[PDB]
């Protein structure tokens, strides 16, 4: 068995083909097992209808999830990615750094 704590990166991207659009991304990488719960949060609120949940694995024991959705970040909301994983005794909330 192997278990690997997801690395969690939360960042915003504009698709270059629609630069007006802003995507909050939670890139959850290198985890094993694949079982995971990943949410994007707006304050503590899970963002529903996260448009993209792209799971892949490299090695059979390394999973990568890009979990991202269009969002419109404003000051009034903190955005975060919340990951639960067996390796994470508590949900890991990685705040979107507004500069990221």
Numbering used by the authors: 0 to 99
Paste lines from the article.
Here, we report the use of the TPBLA to explore the role of the protein sequence in determining the aggregation of the naturally amyloidogenic protein, β2m. Another example is β2m, in which aggregation of the wild-type (WT) protein is associated with the deposition of amyloid fibrils in the joints of patients undergoing long-term renal dialysis (dialysis-related amyloidosis [DRA]). More recently, two single-point variants of this protein, D76N and V27M, have been identified in amyloid deposits in the viscera or tongue, respectively, with the former occurring in the absence of kidney disease.
To examine the structural effect of other amino acid substitutions at this site, the crystal structures of seven variants (D76E-, D76A-, D76S-, D76G-, D76Q-, D76Y-, and D76K-β2m) were determined at high resolution (1.15 to 1.52 Å). Comparison of the crystal structures of D76E-, D76A-, D76S-, D76G-, D76Q-, D76Y-, and D76K-β2m with those of WT- and D76N-β2m revealed no substantial differences that could explain their different stabilities and aggregation propensities (RMSD < 0.6 Å over all heavy atoms). For D76N-β2m, the network of hydrogen bonds involving the sidechains of N42, T73, and Y78 found in the CD and EF loops of WT-β2m is maintained in the variant. For other variants, the loop structure is maintained despite these hydrogen bonds either not forming (D76A-, D76G-, and D76Y-β2m), or being reduced in number (D76K-β2m hydrogen bonds to N42, and D76S-β2m hydrogen bonds to N42 and T73). Comparing protein stability and aggregation suggests that variants that are most (Tm;app > 60 °C; WT-β2m) or least stable (Tm;app ≤ 48 °C; D76L-, D76P-, D76I-, D76W-, D76F-, D76C-, and D76R-β2m) either lose the ability to form amyloid fibrils or do so very slowly (with the sole exception of D76M-β2m: Tm;app 48.7 ± 0.4 °C and Thalf 10.3 ± 1.2 h).
